[PDB]
Design an enzyme around this catalytic site. Structure first.
Site, mmCIF file in Angstrom:
data_model
loop_
_atom_site.group_PDB
_atom_site.id
_atom_site.type_symbol
_atom_site.label_atom_id
_atom_site.label_comp_id
_atom_site.label_asym_id
_atom_site.label_seq_id
_atom_site.Cartn_x
_atom_site.Cartn_y
_atom_site.Cartn_z
ATOM 1 N N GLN A 88 -4.404 23.354 9.997
ATOM 2 C CA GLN A 88 -5.746 23.036 9.130
ATOM 3 C C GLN A 88 -6.712 23.900 9.705
ATOM 4 O O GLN A 88 -6.863 24.077 10.969
ATOM 5 C CB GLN A 88 -5.936 21.582 9.232
ATOM 6 C CG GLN A 88 -7.308 21.190 8.865
ATOM 7 C CD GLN A 88 -8.486 21.381 9.809
ATOM 8 O OE1 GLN A 88 -8.350 21.344 10.927
ATOM 9 N NE2 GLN A 88 -9.620 21.537 9.273
ATOM 10 N N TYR A 100 -11.215 24.804 9.823
ATOM 11 C CA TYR A 100 -12.367 24.612 9.619
ATOM 12 C C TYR A 100 -13.024 25.994 9.511
ATOM 13 O O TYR A 100 -12.743 26.906 10.487
ATOM 14 C CB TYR A 100 -13.130 23.626 10.539
ATOM 15 C CG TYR A 100 -12.729 22.124 10.456
ATOM 16 C CD1 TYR A 100 -13.229 21.712 9.015
ATOM 17 C CD2 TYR A 100 -12.491 21.263 11.266
ATOM 18 C CE1 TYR A 100 -13.122 20.093 8.757
ATOM 19 C CE2 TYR A 100 -12.445 19.928 11.154
ATOM 20 C CZ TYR A 100 -12.698 19.429 9.572
ATOM 21 O OH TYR A 100 -12.540 17.972 9.363
ATOM 22 N N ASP A 111 -14.364 19.704 2.421
ATOM 23 C CA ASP A 111 -15.102 18.921 2.197
ATOM 24 C C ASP A 111 -16.010 18.414 3.345
ATOM 25 O O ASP A 111 -16.515 17.384 3.462
ATOM 26 C CB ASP A 111 -14.279 17.644 1.809
ATOM 27 C CG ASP A 111 -13.410 17.037 2.606
ATOM 28 O OD1 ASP A 111 -13.235 17.514 3.696
ATOM 29 O OD2 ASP A 111 -12.763 15.959 2.278
ATOM 30 N N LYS A 140 -7.893 21.369 0.856
ATOM 31 C CA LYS A 140 -7.877 19.961 1.157
ATOM 32 C C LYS A 140 -9.584 19.325 1.038
ATOM 33 O O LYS A 140 -10.332 19.842 1.815
ATOM 34 C CB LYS A 140 -7.650 19.828 2.612
ATOM 35 C CG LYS A 140 -7.584 18.291 2.981
ATOM 36 C CD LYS A 140 -6.954 18.042 4.296
ATOM 37 C CE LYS A 140 -6.955 16.428 4.793
ATOM 38 N NZ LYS A 140 -8.346 15.939 5.374
ATOM 39 N N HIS A 145 -11.373 12.624 2.253
ATOM 40 C CA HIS A 145 -11.300 12.695 3.777
ATOM 41 C C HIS A 145 -11.374 11.296 4.405
ATOM 42 O O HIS A 145 -12.117 10.889 5.277
ATOM 43 C CB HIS A 145 -12.715 13.439 4.285
ATOM 44 C CG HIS A 145 -12.436 13.951 5.725
ATOM 45 N ND1 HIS A 145 -12.401 15.367 5.573
ATOM 46 C CD2 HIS A 145 -12.264 13.823 6.857
ATOM 47 C CE1 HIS A 145 -12.191 15.944 7.137
ATOM 48 N NE2 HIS A 145 -12.218 14.846 7.578
ATOM 49 N N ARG A 200 -14.554 9.464 5.259
ATOM 50 C CA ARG A 200 -15.385 9.879 6.315
ATOM 51 C C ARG A 200 -16.463 10.632 6.184
ATOM 52 O O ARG A 200 -17.347 11.035 6.872
ATOM 53 C CB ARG A 200 -14.488 10.284 7.463
ATOM 54 C CG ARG A 200 -13.411 9.439 8.070
ATOM 55 C CD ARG A 200 -12.385 10.072 8.824
ATOM 56 N NE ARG A 200 -12.803 10.472 10.317
ATOM 57 C CZ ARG A 200 -12.860 9.931 11.334
ATOM 58 N NH1 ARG A 200 -12.758 8.336 11.381
ATOM 59 N NH2 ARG A 200 -13.000 10.284 12.393
ATOM 60 N N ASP A 240 -4.342 12.038 -0.332
ATOM 61 C CA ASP A 240 -4.398 11.481 0.794
ATOM 62 C C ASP A 240 -5.341 10.293 0.545
ATOM 63 O O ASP A 240 -6.263 10.184 -0.345
ATOM 64 C CB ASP A 240 -4.319 12.057 2.111
ATOM 65 C CG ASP A 240 -5.656 12.636 2.440
ATOM 66 O OD1 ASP A 240 -6.720 12.287 1.630
ATOM 67 O OD2 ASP A 240 -5.769 13.679 3.276
ATOM 68 N N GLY A 252 -2.521 9.795 7.577
ATOM 69 C CA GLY A 252 -3.532 9.861 8.748
ATOM 70 C C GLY A 252 -3.306 8.939 9.734
ATOM 71 O O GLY A 252 -2.733 8.833 10.579
ATOM 72 N N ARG A 253 -4.426 7.879 9.506
ATOM 73 C CA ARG A 253 -4.623 6.734 10.571
ATOM 74 C C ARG A 253 -3.306 5.859 11.027
ATOM 75 O O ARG A 253 -3.024 5.899 12.338
ATOM 76 C CB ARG A 253 -5.467 5.715 10.065
ATOM 77 C CG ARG A 253 -6.953 6.281 10.047
ATOM 78 C CD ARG A 253 -7.927 5.324 9.034
ATOM 79 N NE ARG A 253 -9.210 5.962 9.246
ATOM 80 C CZ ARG A 253 -9.829 6.183 8.208
ATOM 81 N NH1 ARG A 253 -9.066 6.649 7.010
ATOM 82 N NH2 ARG A 253 -11.157 6.723 7.958
HETATM 83 C C1 LIG Z 1 -9.839 10.297 13.340
HETATM 84 C C2 LIG Z 1 -9.727 11.079 12.372
HETATM 85 C C3 LIG Z 1 -9.743 12.672 12.456
HETATM 86 C C4 LIG Z 1 -9.566 13.465 11.411
HETATM 87 N N1 LIG Z 1 -9.765 14.809 11.586
HETATM 88 C C5 LIG Z 1 -9.486 15.542 10.601
HETATM 89 C C6 LIG Z 1 -9.541 17.227 10.638
HETATM 90 O O1 LIG Z 1 -9.926 17.639 11.921
HETATM 91 N N2 LIG Z 1 -9.662 17.774 9.607
HETATM 92 C C7 LIG Z 1 -9.241 17.415 8.456
HETATM 93 O O2 LIG Z 1 -9.339 18.170 7.344
HETATM 94 N N3 LIG Z 1 -9.225 16.079 8.318
HETATM 95 C C8 LIG Z 1 -9.134 15.222 9.319
HETATM 96 N N4 LIG Z 1 -9.166 13.887 8.942
HETATM 97 C C9 LIG Z 1 -8.836 13.451 7.675
HETATM 98 C C10 LIG Z 1 -7.373 12.978 7.280
HETATM 99 O O3 LIG Z 1 -6.742 14.658 7.266
HETATM 100 C C11 LIG Z 1 -6.889 12.606 6.161
HETATM 101 O O4 LIG Z 1 -7.648 13.246 5.143
HETATM 102 C C12 LIG Z 1 -7.147 11.030 6.209
HETATM 103 O O5 LIG Z 1 -6.958 10.574 7.498
HETATM 104 C C13 LIG Z 1 -6.553 10.160 5.173
HETATM 105 O O6 LIG Z 1 -6.684 8.988 4.919
HETATM 106 P P1 LIG Z 1 -5.602 7.774 5.851
HETATM 107 O O7 LIG Z 1 -6.308 7.921 7.194
HETATM 108 O O8 LIG Z 1 -6.308 6.681 5.332
HETATM 109 O O9 LIG Z 1 -4.123 8.232 5.737
HETATM 110 C C14 LIG Z 1 -9.177 13.052 9.993
HETATM 111 C C15 LIG Z 1 -9.132 11.631 9.828
HETATM 112 C C16 LIG Z 1 -9.364 10.680 10.881
HETATM 113 C C17 LIG Z 1 -9.067 9.226 10.603
HETATM 114 O O1 LIG Z 2 -12.911 13.439 10.289
HETATM 115 C C1 LIG Z 2 -13.101 13.861 11.441
HETATM 116 O O2 LIG Z 2 -13.385 13.283 12.502
HETATM 117 C C2 LIG Z 2 -12.791 15.317 11.686
HETATM 118 O O3 LIG Z 2 -12.489 15.639 10.263
HETATM 119 C C3 LIG Z 2 -14.012 16.069 12.243
HETATM 120 C C4 LIG Z 2 -14.647 16.739 11.437
HETATM 121 C C5 LIG Z 2 -15.907 17.462 12.054
HETATM 122 C C6 LIG Z 2 -15.865 17.496 13.407
HETATM 123 C C7 LIG Z 2 -15.084 16.945 14.015
HETATM 124 C C8 LIG Z 2 -13.909 15.966 13.487
#
Ligand SMILES: Cc1cc2nc3c(=O)[nH]c(=O)nc-3n(C[C@H](O)[C@H](O)[C@H](O)COP(=O)(O)O)c2cc1C
Ligand SMILES: O=C(O)[C@@H](O)c1ccccc1
Ligand SMILES: Cc1cc2nc3c(=O)[nH]c(=O)nc-3n(C[C@H](O)[C@H](O)[C@H](O)COP(=O)(O)O)c2cc1C
Ligand SMILES: Cc1cc2nc3c(=O)[nH]c(=O)nc-3n(C[C@H](O)[C@H](O)[C@H](O)COP(=O)(O)O)c2cc1C
Ligand SMILES: Cc1cc2nc3c(=O)[nH]c(=O)nc-3n(C[C@H](O)[C@H](O)[C@H](O)COP(=O)(O)O)c2cc1C
Ligand SMILES: O=C(O)[C@@H](O)c1ccccc1
Ligand SMILES: O=C(O)[C@@H](O)c1ccccc1
Ligand SMILES: O=C(O)[C@@H](O)c1ccccc1
Ligand SMILES: O=C(O)[C@@H](O)c1ccccc1
Ligand SMILES: O=C(O)[C@@H](O)c1ccccc1
Ligand SMILES: O=C(O)[C@@H](O)c1ccccc1
Ligand SMILES: O=C(O)[C@@H](O)c1ccccc1
Lengths: 334, 334, 334, 334
Positions: B125, B127, B155, B205, B229, B232, B260, B283-284
């Protein structure tokens, strides 16, 4: 440290006397319309765009011949000294400093001339009076004092049934007065009398029917506010946000179309914009901020809203408010 | 003994410090989009088929030139050492053993080369960084280390407003770092720079708008992840699951379409598949498993999900994931 | 004194061991389909007719060559000795006396021949066995014993994931056995093998897809039961009641179309009929009655249901079940 | 001091014996239709008009040859002495003084002649009796006593299953009797017998199907009441308010179309009017007022309703009930 507008409501509830908090929070009847304003916004989801240029995101708009820092103005809220001793002056100063228009009320607790002297290119909200000639006097006072638009409230032939106020036996404290003074139902004839009396844009606040929006344009209005008066007038009136898209399509650029009712975040501003609004008004949250911390409270609220609007716009791929108006939406379930 | 993914959340809440659980669980703003991801899945009902041959039910798919054991990959989740001392290595090992792709993050707390050395044909992945040339360096590192796809997250021009993190004053512990290091908004130009730099499939994504999905195909993407995302980023963004069917129809086989957000069971995987997804990300729940019991926890989660997917598919009359994509659905009320 | 079916659930919960009540009450997975069966019925409202002749209201139907006293049969429920020592004999006796068909299960805890000897022109539910020839032996036994229809359950290639049973560690008590014995997934070929082996009407239970209903008719089925197995099989399967109208239209009189899942009153029977059902099956409530008071309990339940059906029909202006099928419905919100 | 109709329910609950409050409040079965009557009204929002002439707002209507002060009549409610010793006389006196029609019941606890002698141009509700000639005697008595319309209740071939009454073992106290006496299902033939016997307008109460409304007009009815009998008859019957618009369109001015069920405010009256009703009936709230404070209670209720109707009409831009019928509505979510 306020991180959401809801932080401010909590703070205002702590400090305000119960009956004053109720005057502020309440709606008419069963508060169906008050609740629906929030329901309607919560049902809207935005379809964001990605990968667009965000090197100069701007939340500014041009409206009624003035740049505003956000697609937002402070709604007319009567009797602001109920909430803080500085009342309208505190709010107007913060709005000025934030670059947000402030709507001076006919029922302001500080005179319109004093509030206008704060600066910041203010608007004036009109309630139709006993007499055409008297009504037109407030309008002329407002114009002479440098107000830039007349926001004619059209949804108050009389005040709604505020059951919280009735149950509380609420009355203005002796120390709060209608400072512009030492009312009748408005009609389309009243609108024409105002339009003929002023060069300022006339904005009709409280329009919900599509044909009334069309007629507003035909009548020479410079804008409308699509609004159920924060759920304080007809209990059971549709939320403005639910009529907004249809109204925007019907007026087809003929006037500015604002909306209010339940805006509680920059995300809500984005939703309103995506449904076609030129700008929103915000009422109760500004008063929460005033009650909690006076001018500085209102400043903090407007800074928070500004940040939330910028954040929401950029996350949605919008470098300008115009781009946000081109976003699509989808209703969900809450 | 975990019999549902919800068993794992309960276990993770017990062991994790509150602020770390909040970093994991939370969304932006009012968490409207976080909640809606679950709402949307709960509204979908499947119309199963009966009496079909189930003598060789297989949950396998081919994606980006590799067989996967399930129509599922581990979503990119930053900073996995927040949840368990072995962090990304524990998760990657379990994913490898389960035959599930693992997405290595730009903000991994173990270097991408170390995680890739675990094996299991990993994704990376991205950024978008300070500089095009730096961005392309991470991409080249990932490719040199044997990553098989570049999942470009589109995003996050900046991070969303995470009110739980703000209220907690959350910061990374000293013992957790961005191990790939000793960021700017992405645009379509960035996508082209990445596409020109690598032979690997580029997967965008965070796509929600139908026209962005179409443009992704036109831009040479090998896949997209239809995603908000995890709630988030933009608070009020539509759930990916609600846009998925329309997006699948619009791209008309031009790229892989993943989804997702809120996948919490094999039944949810089936729903996503029936709405047209090629595969899902999770993810979670993977982090809950990591927190609860490290590598073995993640193994157990993936075994449970595998069983639930097989079960749901067979009960729905589907001997393959392709058959599951041909199932019809019907929205209900919850 | 029971005045509603809910009186019986309360009584059954009092007397049954928790794990047995859970075996009875539970569904698969998150119990989404179990709950949706009730949701779906509660959303349906009937548009009653007035001023029609009600001088001879009859709740009778003709189905599979027999008059039945109500548009209702007792659903197949395995292992009835779990609920009362007399098990299937108590239920079958009460059904006989009420003029309601009783469905003898493949997994009955009393042999099918014993239950058939009770009388009342019984049906036989088939699960597909190890072997075609063995399957056909149960069918031949049922036919020789005087069963009048073969209810082939088509939605159980294997049993669903019953999380209550898993968490309880539920197993059959030593004193409950599958009395017909000293299973494989069914296919359309299995249906044909059964159809070729018997002169009895073959009824496919567990159909939800419209095309499966059409294929059932093409395959020579005498009936179908539109059903998600009481929410015990695919978690997330649509309720039968939501597919019923579309299925009735598609089969266009080619076979009987029954429905089950969540029928809890005569009003629910009326709703099912108005949506086009030939008849309903009732499962859990019959077991509540059995648990609460044995044969007399089941008698009282069937008397109550009979009264409720008569009441609902007459209030809706229907002197016959055919008239009830011509009622219109309208979805509401609950 | 009552400021809403809900104030009166609270007062009535305090004073009435539980089983009498239950007889009043309850519905049939699960009370699905009782609840839905309220749900349906709460889902309707009005689109108000602005800026119209309100210099002579009038809530009056002409119906069945009499002016009424409001678009409202007191619904037929049996046995009013259950609620207050003065029973029907108290209610009829207050209705007369308010200029509202009062519906005298076949099952009145004071004779119809006594109630008619109160004055106020009363209506008479008919239940079809043992015999055509007896039925026609009540009708002739009503006409001779000066009743101005015959409200033939058509939704009671027999009384619904009132589970509260069953559970309470409710029976009339010795001191309450059917004072018109010292019943069979009605049909269209019964309607014709009544129509042939009287010059008074015949109003069919309890119509929900569009074709029954059309047939009512064809049968010579002067009006219908679109009604599910306050949720007391078929449990699961659609609310009248949900059928009203379709019925109004179908009869296309051929008879008066009234509605009842759940009217609890002047705003609800406005909603009913905007959906096309000629007038509403109000049942339970009138009895709450009677129970709370006798004749004076009913007077206060009617004054409150009158104020609420005037308020709602004017806020919606309607100077007459006809204008209110031309308002548009929009369904929301509650
Ligand atoms: C704690 C946390 C950190 C994440 N970090 C990233 C990231 O660094 N890059 C990214 O593309 N998505 C990130 N995501 C988003 C996840 O890839 C994903 O889109 C999301 O967790 C999917 O939903 P779910 O947690 O309900 O399965 C993060 C999600 C969480 C909960
Ligand atoms: O959702 C998240 O926490 C990650 O996608 C994330 C995004 C930007 C900085 C740090 C971590
Ligand atoms: C306490 C209070 C007083 C108000 N006074 C006025 C007024 O004098 N004139 C007017 O046009 N609107 C008035 N409004 C309505 C607001 O302008 C605005 O329509 C409403 O507050 C928007 O909803 P919001 O409070 O949910 O943001 C008032 C609102 C409140 C809460
Ligand atoms: C405890 C239990 C056992 C069941 N056993 C069988 C079975 O052996 N065969 C079958 O076809 N259906 C079986 N069913 C499903 C029922 O026939 C029926 O589809 C379901 O009970 C209808 O829903 P209801 O319980 O809501 O009325 C069973 C249901 C329950 C609750
Ligand atoms: C206690 C009670 C008794 C009633 N008696 C009669 C009756 O004798 N005849 C009749 O036509 N309707 C009768 N109704 C129905 C009412 O006329 C009316 O349809 C219903 O009360 C309207 O709903 P509301 O109570 O929500 O206003 C009765 C209703 C109640 C609550
Ligand atoms: O909503 C409100 O309270 C104001 O719009 C208002 C209206 C009429 C009189 C006083 C104040
Ligand atoms: O029905 C619609 O789509 C709109 O009226 C609408 C409804 C709810 C919120 C915003 C907009
Ligand atoms: O509106 C629709 O049908 C889809 O957008 C949709 C909505 C909710 C869940 C999944 C899919
Ligand atoms: O739903 C149930 O419990 C039965 O249909 C059943 C199915 C398979 C094995 C045992 C019992
Ligand atoms: O969507 C529809 O109208 C039907 O599928 C339906 C939905 C809910 C209950 C019964 C029937
Ligand atoms: O709803 C009610 O209670 C009345 O309509 C009624 C109907 C039948 C007998 C007595 C009373
Ligand atoms: O479906 C519709 O719009 C109407 O039947 C209706 C539904 C709910 C309240 C009033 C009217």
């Amino acid at each position: 440290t306020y991180v959401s507008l809801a932080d401010l409501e909590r703070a205002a509830r702590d400090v305000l006397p119960g009956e004053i908090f109720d005057f502020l929070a309440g709606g008419s009847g069963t508060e169906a319309s008050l609740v629906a304003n929030r329901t309607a916004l919560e049902r809207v989801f935005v379809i964001p765009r990605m990968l667009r240029d965000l090197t100069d995101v701007t939340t500014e708009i041009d409206i009624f011949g003035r740049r505003a820092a956000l697609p937002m103005a402070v709604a007319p809220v009567a009797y602001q000294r109920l909430f803080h001793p500085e009342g309208e002056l505190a709010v107007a100063r913060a709005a000025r400093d934030a670059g947000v228009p402030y709507t001076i009320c006919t029922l302001s607790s500080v005179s319109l001339e004093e509030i206008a002297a704060v600066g910041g290119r203010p608007w004036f909200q009109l309630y139709w009076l006993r007499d055409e000639k008297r009504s037109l006097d407030l309008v002329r006072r407002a114009e002479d004092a440098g107000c830039e638009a007349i926001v004619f409230t059209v949804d108050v032939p009389w005040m709604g049934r505020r059951l919280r106020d009735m149950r509380n036996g609420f009355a203005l404290p002796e120390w709060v007065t209608a400072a512009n003074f030492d009312f009748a139902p408005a009609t389309w004839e009243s609108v024409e009398a105002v339009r003929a009396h002023t060069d300022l844009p006339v904005v009709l606040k409280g329009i919900l029917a599509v044909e009334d929006a069309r007629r507003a344009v035909d009548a020479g209005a410079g804008g409308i506010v699509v609004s159920n008066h924060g759920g304080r007038q007809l209990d059971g009136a549709v939320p403005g946000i639910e009529m907004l898209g249809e109204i925007v399509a019907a007026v087809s650029g003929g006037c500015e179309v604002l909306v209010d009712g339940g805006i509680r975040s920059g995300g809500d501003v984005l939703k309103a914009t995506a449904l076609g609004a030129s700008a929103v008004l915000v009422g109760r949250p500004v008063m929460w901020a005033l009650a909690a911390a006076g001018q500085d409270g209102v400043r903090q609220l407007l800074e928070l809203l500004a940040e939330e609007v910028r954040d929401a716009m950029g996350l949605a791929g919008c470098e300008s408010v115009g781009a946000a108006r081109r976003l699509n939406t989808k209703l969900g379930v809450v």
